[PDB]
Structure 1
Amino acid sequence: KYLKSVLRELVTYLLFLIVLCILTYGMMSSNVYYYTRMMSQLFLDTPVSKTEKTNFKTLSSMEDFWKFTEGSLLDGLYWKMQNRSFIFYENLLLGVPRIRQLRVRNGSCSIPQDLRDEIKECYDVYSVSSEDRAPFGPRNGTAWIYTSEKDLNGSSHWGIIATYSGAGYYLDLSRTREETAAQVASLKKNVWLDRGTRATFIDFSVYNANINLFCVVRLLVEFPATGGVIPSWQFQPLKLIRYVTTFDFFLAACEIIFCFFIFYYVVEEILEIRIHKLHYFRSFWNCLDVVIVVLSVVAIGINIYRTSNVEVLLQFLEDQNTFPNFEHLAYWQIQFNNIAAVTVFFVWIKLFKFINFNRTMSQLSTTMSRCAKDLFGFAIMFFIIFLAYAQLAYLVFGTQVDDFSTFQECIFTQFRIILGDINFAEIEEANRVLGPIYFTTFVFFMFFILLNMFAAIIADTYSEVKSDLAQQ
């Protein structure tokens, strides 16, 4: 007695962790992080033309932007053969890219009485109540047609500086360079866009015949009404053609087994709820089981959503002159990362359950109950000081440093300073005074006080637990 409940459960948890690890072994490649980093880094390398070299970050003025627009802005995907356009014979001319842009309308407010004749194009921030469908220009073709997003097989935007709705217009490329170049030249002859655009998203789907896996690239551009534009780009390894060999069948069988195990665990918990202590939360240890159940439910829901998207996506590839619609199953890499995290959590739970066999090598590492929260009081007071330093650095610097250009990466710069990567080659001449002061007062208060107190907070806990164990 008093040993089956600590052995059978540990063995079952270890077996579940092993099964999850086996399933995740053939799920994603080991270079997924490096591939994602390379894709994110090389998303802003568009040249201007043979005359000027105004890149994306070097084309903001008149002639620089004009040179950037006129050139290889749309010739990146289409390349001349040694029709078809394959850069490395891996992504042939099978489909066309898509572009979505959302705009708003001006004149939705009243100008001040003093500036009635001075302020006319006074437009507030774009919103759902500021949607317009007024087309401008001469109606000559079908490129100026009004349509919604629900009936066009689309979705929302979810931008950075502006999360606009699904309204706007869409543009599609061609399957050859000969027509695409002519269309681009014709469009560039006159104006092509207005200043009222809120969010812009370019989505590209590539077959990538070298390795059977769908590839999706998303580039976001959002312009707010307070000034400034936040650009971003990312890639996602969408899973829609994963059925290749018996590995797909093995993965499906593993998913079915995991679903059956989750159902059995839920049934056991239900049978041990209504006939046992229910509606109880004063344990501080069962929260781990609740989180495990929630993670299993989330994984099951992700698998169900992926299956539904795959079933919906089976209606594509009807013709040989269209593009693959992958704007509905772009949550594959995130789902795989979540599955890996869930497997790691299951392994951790199994190890925690099975570590009770250790006489004294694991009893000192079980101090969560003694330290129930007992530590967020340090995390909050550390993050407040971190944000204060980040704000100070982003204000005093940020114009002649080339590093502290925006907050999200100022956080990363301070983190790298903590880790040991210090530059100190641009701070000193950016500001001779208050520059070194920042660095010294940061290193002194980080490496001598806070990081030195976070050791004591767990030292005293260990001493207290050891005292209790000795006295017991």
Structure 2
Amino acid sequence: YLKSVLRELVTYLLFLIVLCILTYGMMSSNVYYYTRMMSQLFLDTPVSKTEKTNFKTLSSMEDFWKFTEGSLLDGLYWKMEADNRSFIFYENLLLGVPRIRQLRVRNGSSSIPQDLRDEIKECYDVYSVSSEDRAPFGPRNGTAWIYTSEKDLNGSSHWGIIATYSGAGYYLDLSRTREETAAQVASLKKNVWLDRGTRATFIDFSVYNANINLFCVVRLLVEFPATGGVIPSWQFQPLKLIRYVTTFDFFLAACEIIFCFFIFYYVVEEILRSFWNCLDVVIVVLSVVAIGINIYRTSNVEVLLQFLEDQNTFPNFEHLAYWQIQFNNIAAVTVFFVWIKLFKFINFNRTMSQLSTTMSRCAKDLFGFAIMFFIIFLAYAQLAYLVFGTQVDDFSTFQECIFTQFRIILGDINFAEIEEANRVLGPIYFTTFVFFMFFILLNMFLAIINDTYSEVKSDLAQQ
């Protein structure tokens, strides 16, 4: 039994390091700064030398147009060298051509107050697939003014902060030179290409670095609520598209196929309560999905080979970025559980074996009270979301209300804006919540543990 379990033990250990390497391998070290530089270059720089706003700060269409004609252009272009080529920071190819796309809503004049009408007029509804405007507004002289379909226009539905956005819309592809684009942009600014009905706009472009070998994929997303104003958001995604350069890169490819063998091995072992069984299943599952994604999704690299042919087009990577995110998401979670599986082997010692059974007994009593806990915890949340959330950012959405309360329990708080929001309930909410939750209810957990812990020490001491 011992050696039999010890047989599986090393199998697990061998399985550990293989994965630990792929993580270490598939992750370059300094990637962070590469993003950080890109981000600061775009997000953090003043729109114009005269203006103090950043892209993070954009409050208006006027703000936006400034940003376009402003730092963005300066951000994208450098001199240097072709001269049709520009290296960002001097280290980074601007890869192919940038693309701007927007979404427009059909005229919503249907909405009827009674009675106002000619004192309005019309309106435009909140973005929806139904409300999406396909009419060819404006001079109709190009893709900018002509609707295209998410099928015809290669692209995927993007999930924004207030809404999901289809790939379809009105778009334009920029130029290789800072000037030609400016001409294009100004033309789009001269003609009004951002109107009442423009809910959201996209700016997508990709960047390659040759020093380290990586691609940065950028989506600048700007939303226009029916309430007016601007909600900027951004995404910077590094990608390793060419997986084979260095011998180490090939060494990982071996390990990847090596790693593939292990899972297939565990697949068989999985075939016939228990917790570790329940655990083992998960790791196997995620592992598969991780691989499936890795193979017939990310390994495609078809867009690259296409773009490599014609480098004057827009290299749509939006999917490739999308998936490796999903990949890293899953890949990480696997590793997390993989470590947790190590506990199954720790019971060798008395103390551990003692502790092992304790937390097991801890579970049932906890799981009951946890229910009792969150019911209250959610009650405040739903309360706060009603009182606040038309005022305070932190409470804006019901999700972040829940989050906010955790930060409160930990002590991260903005109290002032709460008190500003409602001078009465704000204090009451904060006081009562901090009282019952943090003084009493939290302690009720720890109370349960002591009992179940001491009891297990008690009766096992009897043996």
TM-score by length of 2: 0.82
Tell me, yes or no, if structure 1 residue 458 matches structure 2 residue 459: no
In structure 2, the CA distance between the partners of 1:357 and 1:311, relative to structure 1 (3 Å rule), is: farther
Q: Is the 8 A contact 1:14 1:350 kept in 2?
A: no
**How far off its partner does 1:317 sit?**
0.8
Shift of residue 96, structure 1, vs aligned partner:
1.8
Per mean C-alpha deviation after superposition, the further-off stretch among 327-336 and 184-193 is: 327-336
* Residues in 2 aligned to 1:294 and 1:303: alpha-carbon distance in whole angstroms: 14
Contact 2:153 2:168 survives alignment (8 Å): no
- Residue 298 (structure 1) shift: 2.0
- 1:157 touches 1:199 (CA, 8 Å); kept in 2? no
Aligned mates of 1:121, 1:77 — CA distance in 2: 39
Comparing 15-24 with 440-449, greater Cα deviation is found at 440-449
For residues 362 and 221 of structure 1, do their structure 2 counterparts lie closer, same or farther at Cα, with a shift above 3 Å needed? farther
Change (3 A) 1:86 1:39: closer
Inter-partner Cα distance in structure 1 for 2:69 and 2:305: 39
CA drift of 1:36 comes to 6.1
**Partner SS state of residue 57, structure 1:** helix
Query: Is structure 2 residue 301 aligned with structure 1 residue 302?
Result: no
Shift of 1:169: 1.6
**Alignment CA distance shift 1:50-1:11 (3 Å):** closer
Residue 235 of structure 1 deviates from its aligned partner by: 1.9
Question: Residues 63, 14 of structure 1: CA spacing in aligned structure 2 closer, same or farther, 3 A cutoff?
Answer: closer
The answer (yes or no) to whether the contact 1:106–1:121 under 8 Å persists in 2 is: yes
State the alpha-carbon separation in 2 of the partners of residues 396 and 113 from structure 1: 29
Tell me by how many angstroms 1:111 deviates. Answer: 3.7
Give the fraction of aligned pairs with identical amino acids, expressed as a percent: 99
Change (3 A) 1:468 1:292: farther
1:239–1:329: 8 Å Cα contact kept in structure 2? no
- Find out whether 1:60 has 2:59 as its counterpart: yes
Q: Cα distance, 1:347 vs. partner? A: 4.1
Q: Which moved more, 1:42-51 or 1:199-208?
A: 42-51
Change (3 A) 1:359 1:34: farther
Q: Cα distance 1:317–1:430, how it changes in 2: closer, same or farther (>3 A)?
A: same
1:175 positional shift: 1.1
Q: Do the aligned residues in 2 keep the contact of 1:39 with 1:234 (CA within 8 Å)?
A: no
Cα offset for 1:21?
1.0
Q: Which residue of 2 aligns with 1:348?
A: 339
**Structure 1: how far apart are the matches of 2:64 and 2:375?**
41
Q: Deviation string for 1:383-428 (max 9, x for gaps)?
A: 4555555666677778998977777666666544543556767777
Q: Distance in 2 between matches of 1:39 and 1:407?
A: 32
Residue in 1 that maps onto 2:46: 47
Q: 1:28 Cα shift?
A: 1.2
* Distance verdict in 2 for CA 1:65–1:214, change over 3 Å: closer
User: CA 1:269–1:6 in 2, change beyond 3 Å: closer, same or farther?
Assistant: same
405-414 or 305-314: which moved more? 405-414
Q: Is the contact made by 1:401 and 1:426 (CA closer than 8 Å) also made in structure 2?
A: yes
Cα 1:48–1:236 change in 2 (3 A) is: closer
Q: What SS does structure 2 have at the residue aligned with 1:93?
A: strand
Alpha-carbon shift at residue 89 of structure 1 (Å): 1.3
Instruction: Report the Cα distance in structure 2 between the residues aligned to 1:423 and 1:268, rounded to whole angstroms.
Output: 52
Distance 2:416 2:143 in 1: 56
Rounded to whole Å, the distance in 1 between the matches of 2:27 and 2:356 is 33
Q: How much has 1:45 moved relative to structure 2?
A: 3.1
Where structure 2 has 5 or more consecutive residues not aligned to the other structure, the ranges are none
Would the aligned equivalents of 2:287 and 2:334 in 1 still touch at CA under 8 Å?
no
Q: Against the structure 1 CA distance between its residues 468 and 316, is the aligned structure 2 distance closer, same or farther, given a 3 Å change threshold? A: farther
CA contact 1:111–1:120 (8 Å) conserved in 2? no
Partners in 1 of 2:116 and 2:91 — Cα distance?
59
Distance 1:169 1:432, change over 3 A: closer
Normalized per residue, the structure richer in helix is 2
Displacement of 1:346: 5.3
Question: What is the CA-CA distance between 1:161 and the residue it aligns to?
Answer: 1.2
The 8 Å contact of residues 213 and 242 in structure 1, kept in 2 or not, is answered as no
Cα deviation for residue 443 of structure 1 reads 3.7
TM-score, normalising length: structure 1: 0.81
Report if the CA contact (8 A) 1:94-1:322 is conserved: no
Displacement after TM superposition at 1:171 (Å): 1.5
Whether the 8 Å contact between 1:149 and 1:167 is mirrored in structure 2 is yes
Match of 1:291 in 2: 282
- Distance in structure 2 (CA, Å) of the matches to 1:134 and 1:20: 52
- What are the Cα deviations for residues 10-38 of structure 1, in whole angstroms up to 9, with x where unaligned? 22112211221122222214556677678
Assess, with a 3 A threshold, how the Cα gap between structure 1 residues 441 and 116 changes in structure 2: closer, same or farther: closer
SS of alignment partner, residue 360 of structure 2: coil
Query: Structure 1 residues 10, 25: CA separation in 2 closer, same or farther (over 3 Å shift)?
Result: same
Distance in 2, matches of 1:404 and 1:36, equals 29
Q: Distance in 2 between matches of 1:227 and 1:194?
A: 11
CA–CA separation in structure 1 for the residues paired with 2:284 and 2:154: 34
Task: Tell me which moved more, 57-66 or 328-337.
Answer: 57-66
Match of 1:154, SS state, is coil
Tell me, yes or no, if structure 1 residue 333 matches structure 2 residue 327. Answer: no
1:47, CA displacement in angstroms? 3.1
Deviation digits for residues 105-132 of structure 1 (CA, Å, limit 9, x no counterpart) = 1248474675566665244444333344
* Cα displacement (A) at 1:9: 1.6
Change (3 A) 1:402 1:298: closer
Q: Tell me the distance in 2 between the aligned counterparts of 1:33 and 1:297.
A: 28
Summarize deviations over 1:287-309 as a string: whole Å, max 9, x none. 11221221222222222244443
In structure 1, C-alpha distance between the alignment counterparts of 2:129 and 2:88, rounded to whole Å: 41
Describe the SS at the equivalent of 2:327.
helix
Cα gap change, 1:149/1:351 in structure 2, threshold over 3 Å: closer, same or farther?
Answer: same
* C-alpha separation in 1, matches of 2:89 and 2:374: 47
Deviation at 1:329, TM superposition (A): 0.9
- Cα distance in 2, alignment partners of residues 434 and 127 from structure 1: 35
Please give the alpha-carbon distance, in whole angstroms, between the structure 2 residues aligned to 1:347 and 1:141: 53
Q: CA deviation at 1:70?
A: 5.6
- Give the 5 Å matches for 1:404-419: 414-419=405-410
Moved more, 369-378 or 61-70: 61-70
Equivalent residues, number:
461
Task: Answer whether contact 1:101 1:169 (CA < 8 A) is retained.
Answer: yes
CA distance in 2, matches of 1:138, 1:107: 22
The alpha carbon displacement at 1:318 in A equals: 0.6
User: How many angstroms does 1:184 deviate by?
Assistant: 2.4
Structure 2 counterpart SS, 1:373 = helix
Q: Using the TM superposition, give the Cα deviation of residue 330 of structure 1 relative to its aligned residue in structure 2, in angstroms.
A: 0.8
Separation in structure 2 between the aligned mates of residue 421 and residue 436 of structure 1, nearest angstrom: 16
Q: 1:303 to 1:42 in 2, by over 3 A?
A: same
Question: 1:155: Cα distance to partner?
Answer: 1.6
Counterpart-to-counterpart distance in 2, 1:424 and 1:112:
38
* 1:270–1:248 Cα change, 3 Å: same
Is the alpha carbon distance of 1:321 and 1:37 closer, same or farther for their aligned partners in structure 2, counting shifts above 3 Å? closer
Flag the structure with more relative contact order, 1 or 2, with Cα contacts below 8 A and sequence separation at least 6. Answer: 1
Moved more, 6-15 or 361-370: 361-370
The root-mean-square deviation of aligned C-alpha atoms, in Å, is 3.9
Q: CA deviation at 1:207?
A: 0.6
Query: Cα offset for 1:350?
Result: 4.5
More strand per residue: 2
**Alignment partners' CA distance in 1, 2:424 and 2:293:** 54
- Contact kept? 1:52, 1:64, Cα under 8 Å: no
